[PDB]
Amino acid sequence: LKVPHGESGKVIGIRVFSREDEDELPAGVNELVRVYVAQKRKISDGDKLAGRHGNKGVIGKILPVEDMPFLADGTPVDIILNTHGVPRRMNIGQILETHLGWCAHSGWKVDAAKGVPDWAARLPDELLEAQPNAIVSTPVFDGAQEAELQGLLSCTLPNRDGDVLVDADGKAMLFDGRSGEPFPYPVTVGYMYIMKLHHLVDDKIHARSTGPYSMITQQPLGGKAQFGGQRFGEMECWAMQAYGAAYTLQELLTIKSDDTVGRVKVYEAIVKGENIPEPGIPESFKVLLKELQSLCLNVEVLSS
Amino acid sequence: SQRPTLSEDVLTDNRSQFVIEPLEPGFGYTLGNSLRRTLLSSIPGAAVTSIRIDGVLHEFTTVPGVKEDVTEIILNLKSLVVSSEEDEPVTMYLRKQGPGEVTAGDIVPPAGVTVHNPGMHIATLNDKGKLEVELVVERGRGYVPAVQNRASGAEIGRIPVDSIYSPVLKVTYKVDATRVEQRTDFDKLILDVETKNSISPRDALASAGKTLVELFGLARELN
Amino acid sequence: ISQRPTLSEDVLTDNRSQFVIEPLEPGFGYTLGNSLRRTLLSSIPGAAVTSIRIDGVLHEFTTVPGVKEDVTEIILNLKSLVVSSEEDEPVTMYLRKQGPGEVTAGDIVPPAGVTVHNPGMHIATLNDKGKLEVELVVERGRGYVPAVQNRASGAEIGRIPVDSIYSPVLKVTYKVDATRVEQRTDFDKLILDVETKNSISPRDALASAGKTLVELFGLARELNVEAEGI
Amino acid sequence: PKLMALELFKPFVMKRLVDLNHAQNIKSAKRMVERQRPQVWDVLEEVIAEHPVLLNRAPTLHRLGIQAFEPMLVEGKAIQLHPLVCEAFNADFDGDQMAVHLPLSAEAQAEARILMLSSNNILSPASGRPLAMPRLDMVTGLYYLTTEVPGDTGEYQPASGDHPETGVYSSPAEAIMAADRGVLSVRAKIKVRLTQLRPPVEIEAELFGHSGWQPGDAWMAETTLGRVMFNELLPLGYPFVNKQMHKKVQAAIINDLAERYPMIVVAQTVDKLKDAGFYWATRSGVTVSMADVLVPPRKKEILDHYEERADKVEKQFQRGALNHDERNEALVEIWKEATDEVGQALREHYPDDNPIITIVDSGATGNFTQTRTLAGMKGLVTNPKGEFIPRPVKSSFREGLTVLEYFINTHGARKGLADTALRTADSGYLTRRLVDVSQDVIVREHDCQTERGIVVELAERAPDGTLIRDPYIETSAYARTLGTDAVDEAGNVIVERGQDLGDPEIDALLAAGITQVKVRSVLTCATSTGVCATCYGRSMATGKLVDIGEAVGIVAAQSIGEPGTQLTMITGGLP
Amino acid sequence: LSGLTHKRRLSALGPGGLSRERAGLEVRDVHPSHYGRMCPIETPEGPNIGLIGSLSVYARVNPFGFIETPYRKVVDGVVSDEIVYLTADEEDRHVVAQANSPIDADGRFVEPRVLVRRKAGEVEYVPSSEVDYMDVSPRQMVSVATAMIPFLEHDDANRALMGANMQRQAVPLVRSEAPLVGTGMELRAAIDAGDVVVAEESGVIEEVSADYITVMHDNGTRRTYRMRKFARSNHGTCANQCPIVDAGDRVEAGQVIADGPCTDDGEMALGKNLLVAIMPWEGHNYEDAIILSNRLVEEDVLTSIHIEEHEIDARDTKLGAEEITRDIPNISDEVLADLDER
Amino acid sequence: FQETTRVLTDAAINCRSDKLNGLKENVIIGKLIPAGTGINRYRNIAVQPTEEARAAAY
Amino acid sequence: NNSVPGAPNRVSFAKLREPLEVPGL
Amino acid sequence: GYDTPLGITNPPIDELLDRVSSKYALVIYAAKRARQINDYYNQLGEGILEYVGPLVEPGLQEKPLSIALREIHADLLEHTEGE
Ligand SMILES: [Mg+2]
Ligand SMILES: [Zn+2]
């Protein structure tokens, strides 16, 4: 047994079951041994991410830390989201979630010397004074209203430098990492919860140039684990016909799927500098012949 | 009317402010951004490369007597900061036995290296177990994946660790413009930098300045 | 760390140029490009016109008598004139003609030092029995400065400040291209593009900009002593 | 990704490497490639200089679903792609996966390099109009760049007594420098002096007296720096365009460029325009915030009045004169009117600065109904039976719904999901059958020299007006070959026999006032097998007459079957 | 969370049930009787839409098999603290109030007119006296997965369903962090999940270790809990437990002692907290694409662990029995340099 | 397409010899499709450098 | 009102009280 | 009358169509020449120079098909139609 195509990592443990030691085993077996391989994966390109409001996405590019936009106090952001997808999908809740997350993270202190503001009438008496990295919870169908967020965003505790970053509306002034000059208009920022989906990229990526061939169908195996080639649907044949491309279809159907001698000869020619010889008769056609000749139907060729 | 610039320093506990002026209009932003970009990624440093834990064959396991497994201690050790004077892999030791706590100050560095934050908490030990860990300290710049040691083909007892050679932590700048109609139209740059205490801000600024000078020297030569 | 040296290639055209720097460490593409473009655009000293005068007109609403062109057209034509000066103080210059015909920059009498690098340039045309006298001042500076910054200037009759261009280069553009020096296959390839006036060559403008930038970063380097790669 | 290309070009790399004497034999070369020594990367870069590859998004649907791009090494494990080709595959950058093939023989290389290349297929086969155009985001950037605003900084002003007239720049370079300095907004009224842009015909024929513009001729324009910067992207010689760039204007400009210039120039200008739009989209200042979605100011009074009228009709029903059906009809119509009024008020409230308004009005995406739902009223919602519930929602998503309203609303989403689930399969089956029926249609002969040509009314002449363009001339008679010359009333010939029709020729015919035209058609082809090339007329993807041997049946089947996905409900839908 | 949802799933197909093709399309739609029993939001995205629901938060199965739902009966316009459980038939035959309707602290209805749900699809205001039943909480119709999506009253049905389905596909990270904003049904959904141990009796911990813990009961009986470390999960991910208790603390009964995967101090944590910005950036975030800072990569903020699994067996054959052996014909020593003696 | 047995029998009885015409059969066999670059009008082309090039090639 | 003994403290935007704890899931 | 392109798209397609009758003929008209060029390269070591090498001077290790396409644009080849 060998490691399949596209696996690596440490060997953490080995379990071996022996019939000598009086270990129950399936009938007709003597020694079944299983090996566990553990690999640590770091998030990379081609990985899925999505919040709790159903907004999927993929990592288009991972810029250096020195290139991302940074707040006026030098705090580079960690992720940038597109804006055209928010109003069309109509998931405005995530904007409120980001605002509330920023408010909770920065900590707030609502003024009360002159009395509770009208917008803060229903706030719990113990929720008027928070600390940095505070924790807040909004039960479904019963949470902070728009006025509550408006009031809270106007009383966030200042940074240790003495200045407040975001405005009342929640936007802030950034600085481009490439040009180095501030953007003409403010942008929204905040902390939003991000999960990690199971559709990783390492599982998907796969290549196959030459490898084991099936014995019953004379075709390359299938699947990433078996190191097999990809499928070629009939719609692809229709498309190739549409362009009028003929030799390409001939190769795809004959010289790279079935013809054994064709594969050997073309591989050798590529290894050398010789031109690729023309394909031959696909195995499918010859099998069809030798099978239809079995029904007493004399199928001639008429090469003339 | 026309004077060369001058750089002065305003000092604080660990983060220093640098003031540069007078600069021609519309030119402070680009200079500040260039300095910031060359500061956060091209400052040489040193950091732990690979560890060696006695009685342990790999990283996905534990060790009796400790409260957290190998992965947690590796994550904690990533925060360790060290400065290398020699340009070759040096070796340290960490031997602590019995109940109590193990901190960054329990390492016995060899000559030519130092640990500047003895207050870090690595882990804690129960009386049952002990601990002896050997780690390497190489000098590099930027950031390197841990897998670099995978291809070296060492023995089982070697565990790679990601290396992050960067003493700078945060940098920011603001420009104080003077847009009066007088020919005194200039801008004043206010650059602030903070370091991990491995090196003072002046050293990092000088290194970045030298890097940019050497890089731009290729254009001053007559073409 | 020596790493790998970065050589500056070059391409040639009538008056344009495409200077190429290859290879660069990942991320240094913009770090060079932006600052270099700004330095080239607003660092090189130069000379240009600042204000003009027309005794034949009291203000700017109307046009000078006996001339086909308009006052705004005359200002635009005279602004693009390329003037090189070697004297710091602002010197004057006079243009005078009589009778029908045309006027060219080369016909303007230059005082000592100042010179015009384009004598065949057109300014305007005169009809029969036409005349115009102009007294334009020339000053040396750097970069671009609008006439608004020169609004308050003593008291005169027909002083009409004009937006000057104190720079021999007027256009710059650059990009960044990926390159494969090793398995990293991410190294940047700066591609600069400059188009200067007739008073300087692109390569000498670039050399002066590099000189100025290196002198500027000499302050940063001088604070301490420490070396790096080539 | 390099990890894929290296394993995909293994034989070529081995051959070229053994040629360079980096190994001694083939087995050693294969082993070294397996070990991936640093001596292989250079050969790998050298061996794929001009080797095309074939991409295929699964499942391919139409002709343009299989392109042929030049490979380029890049790190990572994701196959990078060009933004403007995603529409061809109808792909969304959210986990879609596509295969990658590779031609081996020298014949397949030329085939994929000439025919299947991406840059030669800007025009969709359905209609002779380009498909790869600014689609989603860069359009917003172009709209922002070309937008005009009054009373900006540095705008043009007239001579005010003792002060000159400011806002005139010698050349675009000076304007760019001024904008960089910070004394000229990118979008303001200016009077620049262009020198390398042909003026519009209205000014070209006047200022130069039709003598003909050439590079080096100056003329005083009146526009904004953004418009000049945009026009600089267009190919040289194109007349200046000085109007705000709505998506319709973008489509018209792109179509005109495709119908007047070769494909390669169109592709180059499209790439440059996309780059400019991406650069200028970021600085448009388009974001989303609570202060952006603004509640209507006086919605409460309108809602109260409509609820009072609803109560009136409720009492009318309580009298017992009316039945349930009449009550439902009254309620539904009243609430539809109320929703319309609230939407009108909400539109009247928002200024022209909110990001939502800027996005929706610029044709970037969405419609006003979504904005009304997000800010105004969601209104009545569908039911599992399809009839509108008598209970309307009185709140927007911004303010916050209630449990009952959400429970009522879920039905529409469920039904839409089911409808899409069935429609995909219906369209697939219809496309398969349509492809099956017409497999053996091919252009055999160059010309059947037949005379029967179907007559189609080009444009009707109004009894009171002079001429009205037919609303379907774009489809019936746009690319067909003219059967007979459409001689004007006089003896002059405006379009000669055999000359293929087109946008300029259609315009010329419209000018001549001709209404009825006989056009050569394929329905009456006299060819024994297949159809002659002349009858078929101008191709779609080529832009010219079809070439002998080209299959047409497959193209027609794909074109007719592709739009089957959106076909929904004597039914009027796909059935 | 995925395991809990699977345990709470309500299938409608399979043996003894209707097939996909024969099942009508109407059954896949909501019914006015679903309120309080089956969540209308949570549902698979695939073709099995509407055939797989989920119990409500407060739903309990009656001994016969008819789902119930708690209610407090208003006797004479005054709310009753005591609650009863009603089935579908009894619920239809009575008047059910609205939980969100304001109610005075003394149980008096401030509003004379209160909205109400009626027999089927009927809602209309009624005097504040005839009303008989009132709901318990506003969250009485949401599922367990959907109950922990903040600001659910602002999103769309399709978006909410998509988010709920996405929440069941997270991957356990190495260093989890509790969300800054999240409903109050996080810790409760984690304690009942079973993947977190908990003390049975209030005792005092004597010593703790990375592999096992020993708590001393107040009655003098010592007990030990063993925590599996780095054991392959049923779906290929990893599972671990890290005690969050110190030596010499009198831990009360019912207090969490260890945190399993996707947990932080006895509460669910399926992700991290990132600083987001909303703006198109050079088209790299074009059409749902995303851009990430290298700080996440170089700080293991979103680093996960995946454990593979392989097995081989040597089964007897008519031609003989196969045996695993270090030696193997015609193989270089280097290839087998890793195999041991066995 | 359909009813393979009946059509096969009918063709066999008549000894219907059919040329490789059309696409579907020609792709089932594997021979070059008689469309696009497959028509005999283009499959048989002889190209050589013009005599002028050869005279001036060296 | 933290039913469990030592859960983390996170104040909530509570306006209404539920008269019964969530039953065993 | 346009900016010089870069990559495999040089020379352009419309220019070539001016020489060849149709795009479907051009692909073979160039592939056969590429085959001849490859054959000449194969025999470069020793043999008969009947398959005259490239007409236009090649670049630095350019594929034979690129050479064929770049020389066809120079109008240096003659061909017979179908049979
Ligand atoms: Mg998708
Ligand atoms: Zn015909």
Numbering used by the authors:
A (entry chain C): 837 to 1140
B (entry chain A): 4 to 226
C (entry chain B): 3 to 232
D (entry chain D): 444 to 1012, 1024 to 1029
E (entry chain C): 446 to 787
F (entry chain D): 1226 to 1283
G (entry chain C): 29 to 53
H (entry chain E): 28 to 110
Give the authors' words.
In bacteria, transcription is carried out by the RNA polymerase (RNAP) core (E) composed of five subunits (α_2_ββ’ω). Here, we show that the stress-response σ^B^ factor from the human pathogen, *Mycobacterium tuberculosis*, induces the RNAP holoenzyme oligomerization into a supramolecular complex composed of eight RNAP units.
In the RNAP dimer, the σ^B^ C-terminal domains of the two Eσ^B^ protomers were stacked together and comprised three disconnected densities, determined at a resolution between 5.5 and 8 Å (**[Fig fig2])**. Two peripheral densities (b1 in R1 and b2 in R5) were buried deeply in the active site cleft of RNAP and occluded the RNA:DNA hybrid path (**[Fig fig2]**). Potentially, the a1-a2 density can comprise domain σ^B^4 or domain σ^B^3.1. Conversely, the atomic model of the σ^B^3.1 dimer perfectly fitted into the density without significant rearrangements (**Figure S8C**). However, at the current resolution, we could not unambiguously assign the a1-a2 density to σ^B^3.1.
